[PDB]
Design a protein around this ligand. Structure first.
Ligand code: NA
Lengths: 108, 109
Protein backbone atom coordinates (compact mmCIF):
# COMPACT_ATOMS: atom_id res chain seq x y z
CA UNK A 1 0.00 0.00 0.00
CA UNK A 2 2.73 2.44 -1.08
CA UNK A 3 1.07 5.18 -3.16
CA UNK A 4 -1.67 5.75 -0.60
CA UNK A 5 -4.01 4.21 1.96
CA UNK A 6 -7.03 3.88 -0.37
CA UNK A 7 -8.31 0.43 -1.36
CA UNK A 8 -11.57 -0.81 -2.93
CA UNK A 9 -12.49 -2.92 0.12
CA UNK A 10 -11.04 -4.31 3.36
CA UNK A 11 -10.64 -7.62 1.55
CA UNK A 12 -8.61 -6.11 -1.32
CA UNK A 13 -6.49 -4.17 1.22
CA UNK A 14 -5.51 -7.43 2.97
CA UNK A 15 -4.78 -9.22 -0.29
CA UNK A 16 -2.76 -6.21 -1.48
CA UNK A 17 -0.58 -6.41 1.68
CA UNK A 18 -0.16 -10.13 1.06
CA UNK A 19 0.89 -9.68 -2.57
CA UNK A 20 3.73 -7.42 -1.28
CA UNK A 21 4.81 -9.59 1.65
CA UNK A 22 4.17 -12.83 -0.29
CA UNK A 23 3.77 -14.62 3.09
CA UNK A 24 2.73 -13.06 6.42
CA UNK A 25 1.87 -13.93 10.01
CA UNK A 26 -1.39 -12.81 11.63
CA UNK A 27 0.41 -10.56 14.16
CA UNK A 28 2.18 -8.81 11.29
CA UNK A 29 -1.05 -8.31 9.32
CA UNK A 30 -2.70 -7.01 12.47
CA UNK A 31 0.10 -4.50 13.04
CA UNK A 32 0.00 -3.34 9.41
CA UNK A 33 -3.75 -2.73 9.62
CA UNK A 34 -3.44 -0.93 12.97
CA UNK A 35 -0.82 1.41 11.55
CA UNK A 36 -2.98 1.84 8.43
CA UNK A 37 -6.16 2.72 10.35
CA UNK A 38 -4.33 5.36 12.42
CA UNK A 39 -3.55 7.37 9.24
CA UNK A 40 -5.92 10.34 8.70
CA UNK A 41 -6.22 9.57 4.95
CA UNK A 42 -7.56 6.01 5.54
CA UNK A 43 -10.94 7.32 6.68
CA UNK A 44 -11.28 8.57 3.13
CA UNK A 45 -11.97 4.94 2.21
CA UNK A 46 -15.71 4.79 1.56
CA UNK A 47 -16.07 1.63 3.69
CA UNK A 48 -13.77 2.80 6.58
CA UNK A 49 -16.84 3.68 8.78
CA UNK A 50 -18.27 0.07 8.47
CA UNK A 51 -16.44 -0.94 11.62
CA UNK A 52 -14.86 0.86 14.55
CA UNK A 53 -11.62 -1.16 14.68
CA UNK A 54 -10.33 -2.83 11.52
CA UNK A 55 -7.22 -4.46 13.11
CA UNK A 56 -9.46 -6.67 15.20
CA UNK A 57 -11.30 -7.84 12.13
CA UNK A 58 -8.18 -9.08 10.33
CA UNK A 59 -8.52 -12.68 11.50
CA UNK A 60 -12.23 -13.02 10.76
CA UNK A 61 -11.74 -11.41 7.34
CA UNK A 62 -8.92 -13.83 6.51
CA UNK A 63 -10.95 -16.86 7.62
CA UNK A 64 -13.89 -15.73 5.45
CA UNK A 65 -11.44 -15.17 2.56
CA UNK A 66 -10.11 -18.70 3.31
CA UNK A 67 -13.62 -20.23 3.10
CA UNK A 68 -14.04 -21.10 6.83
CA UNK A 69 -17.52 -19.48 7.13
CA UNK A 70 -20.04 -21.47 5.04
CA UNK A 71 -19.07 -22.84 -4.65
CA UNK A 72 -16.78 -20.12 -3.37
CA UNK A 73 -13.10 -20.12 -4.39
CA UNK A 74 -10.53 -19.32 -1.59
CA UNK A 75 -8.35 -16.23 -1.93
CA UNK A 76 -6.00 -17.16 0.93
CA UNK A 77 -4.80 -20.14 2.94
CA UNK A 78 -3.21 -20.46 6.37
CA UNK A 79 -0.58 -23.18 6.85
CA UNK A 80 -0.45 -24.33 10.46
CA UNK A 81 3.12 -25.68 10.12
CA UNK A 82 4.47 -22.20 9.19
CA UNK A 83 1.93 -19.94 10.94
CA UNK A 84 1.82 -17.93 7.62
CA UNK A 85 -1.09 -16.63 5.57
CA UNK A 86 -0.53 -16.99 1.79
CA UNK A 87 -2.33 -15.87 -1.34
CA UNK A 88 -3.75 -18.74 -3.44
CA UNK A 89 -6.76 -9.02 -5.77
CA UNK A 90 -6.03 -7.65 -9.32
CA UNK A 91 -9.14 -7.99 -11.53
CA UNK A 92 -11.04 -9.61 -8.57
CA UNK A 93 -11.73 -6.35 -6.75
CA UNK A 94 -15.35 -6.19 -7.90
CA UNK A 95 -15.95 -9.67 -6.54
CA UNK A 96 -14.06 -8.93 -3.36
CA UNK A 97 -16.13 -5.70 -2.88
CA UNK A 98 -19.34 -7.70 -3.23
CA UNK A 99 -18.02 -10.41 -0.88
CA UNK A 100 -16.95 -7.74 1.63
CA UNK A 101 -20.48 -6.30 1.73
CA UNK A 102 -21.92 -9.80 2.11
CA UNK A 103 -19.58 -10.54 5.01
CA UNK A 104 -20.52 -7.22 6.68
CA UNK A 105 -24.24 -8.08 6.35
CA UNK A 106 -23.75 -11.62 7.65
CA UNK A 107 -20.98 -11.55 10.27
CA UNK A 108 -22.70 -10.01 13.33
CA UNK B 1 -0.27 -1.15 -5.70
CA UNK B 2 -3.80 -0.33 -6.96
CA UNK B 3 -5.46 2.40 -9.03
CA UNK B 4 -7.51 3.73 -6.12
CA UNK B 5 -7.03 7.30 -4.81
CA UNK B 6 -9.18 9.49 -2.51
CA UNK B 7 -9.82 12.07 -5.31
CA UNK B 8 -8.71 13.17 -8.77
CA UNK B 9 -6.65 15.86 -7.03
CA UNK B 10 -4.77 13.35 -4.83
CA UNK B 11 -4.25 11.13 -7.94
CA UNK B 12 -2.63 14.07 -9.75
CA UNK B 13 -0.41 15.02 -6.79
CA UNK B 14 0.68 11.38 -6.28
CA UNK B 15 1.81 11.20 -9.92
CA UNK B 16 3.81 14.41 -9.31
CA UNK B 17 5.36 13.16 -6.05
CA UNK B 18 6.98 10.39 -8.07
CA UNK B 19 8.21 12.04 -11.32
CA UNK B 20 9.00 15.08 -9.11
CA UNK B 21 8.41 17.28 -12.19
CA UNK B 22 6.17 16.57 -15.24
CA UNK B 23 4.79 18.16 -18.43
CA UNK B 24 1.07 18.46 -19.26
CA UNK B 25 1.21 15.80 -22.02
CA UNK B 26 3.09 13.47 -19.63
CA UNK B 27 0.41 13.94 -16.99
CA UNK B 28 -2.33 13.55 -19.60
CA UNK B 29 -0.82 10.29 -20.90
CA UNK B 30 -0.58 8.94 -17.33
CA UNK B 31 -4.22 9.75 -16.57
CA UNK B 32 -5.31 8.25 -19.92
CA UNK B 33 -3.60 4.93 -19.14
CA UNK B 34 -5.03 5.08 -15.61
CA UNK B 35 -8.66 5.58 -16.74
CA UNK B 36 -8.28 2.74 -19.24
CA UNK B 37 -7.45 0.29 -16.46
CA UNK B 38 -10.37 -1.83 -15.27
CA UNK B 39 -9.47 -1.17 -11.61
CA UNK B 40 -9.92 2.63 -11.99
CA UNK B 41 -13.73 2.58 -12.21
CA UNK B 42 -13.70 1.30 -8.63
CA UNK B 43 -12.94 4.86 -7.50
CA UNK B 44 -16.15 6.23 -5.91
CA UNK B 45 -15.61 9.52 -7.82
CA UNK B 46 -14.69 7.91 -11.21
CA UNK B 47 -18.10 8.57 -12.72
CA UNK B 48 -18.21 12.28 -11.77
CA UNK B 49 -16.70 12.87 -15.26
CA UNK B 50 -16.62 10.83 -18.48
CA UNK B 51 -13.04 11.76 -19.46
CA UNK B 52 -10.45 12.44 -16.76
CA UNK B 53 -7.37 13.06 -18.89
CA UNK B 54 -9.21 15.96 -20.56
CA UNK B 55 -9.63 17.53 -17.06
CA UNK B 56 -5.96 17.35 -16.05
CA UNK B 57 -5.21 20.96 -17.11
CA UNK B 58 -8.22 22.59 -15.38
CA UNK B 59 -7.62 20.46 -12.27
CA UNK B 60 -3.99 21.60 -12.10
CA UNK B 61 -4.96 25.20 -12.69
CA UNK B 62 -7.38 24.87 -9.75
CA UNK B 63 -4.73 23.39 -7.48
CA UNK B 64 -2.32 26.16 -8.69
CA UNK B 65 -4.64 28.90 -7.37
CA UNK B 66 -5.70 30.03 -10.88
CA UNK B 67 -9.43 29.70 -9.95
CA UNK B 68 -11.66 31.91 -7.80
CA UNK B 69 -13.72 29.08 -6.20
CA UNK B 70 -11.18 28.40 -3.41
CA UNK B 71 -11.37 29.19 0.32
CA UNK B 72 -9.72 32.42 1.54
CA UNK B 73 -6.82 30.50 3.10
CA UNK B 74 -6.06 28.59 -0.04
CA UNK B 75 -2.46 27.68 -0.49
CA UNK B 76 -1.58 26.27 -3.97
CA UNK B 77 -0.39 22.66 -4.18
CA UNK B 78 1.31 22.95 -7.58
CA UNK B 79 2.98 25.48 -9.80
CA UNK B 80 3.72 25.60 -13.51
CA UNK B 81 7.06 27.04 -14.66
CA UNK B 82 6.68 28.50 -18.15
CA UNK B 83 10.43 28.50 -18.88
CA UNK B 84 10.49 24.69 -18.31
CA UNK B 85 6.84 23.81 -19.26
CA UNK B 86 6.89 21.50 -16.19
CA UNK B 87 4.30 21.24 -13.38
CA UNK B 88 5.77 20.79 -9.86
CA UNK B 89 4.45 20.21 -6.35
CA UNK B 90 4.80 22.93 -3.78
CA UNK B 91 6.50 21.53 -0.64
CA UNK B 92 -1.29 14.53 4.70
CA UNK B 93 -3.47 16.98 2.82
CA UNK B 94 -5.77 14.33 1.39
CA UNK B 95 -8.87 15.24 3.35
CA UNK B 96 -8.51 18.88 2.37
CA UNK B 97 -7.90 17.84 -1.24
CA UNK B 98 -11.05 15.65 -1.19
CA UNK B 99 -13.11 18.59 0.05
CA UNK B 100 -11.46 20.93 -2.49
CA UNK B 101 -12.17 18.33 -5.25
CA UNK B 102 -15.92 18.45 -4.46
CA UNK B 103 -15.76 22.24 -4.31
CA UNK B 104 -14.26 22.17 -7.84
CA UNK B 105 -16.86 19.63 -9.05
CA UNK B 106 -19.64 21.88 -7.80
CA UNK B 107 -18.35 25.21 -9.05
CA UNK B 108 -16.58 24.44 -12.36
CA UNK B 109 -19.93 24.22 -14.17
NA1 NA C 1 -4.67 3.09 -3.45
Amino acid sequence: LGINEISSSFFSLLLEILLLESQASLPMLEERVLDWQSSPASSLNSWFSAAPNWAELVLPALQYLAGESRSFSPFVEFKEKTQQWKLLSQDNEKELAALFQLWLETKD
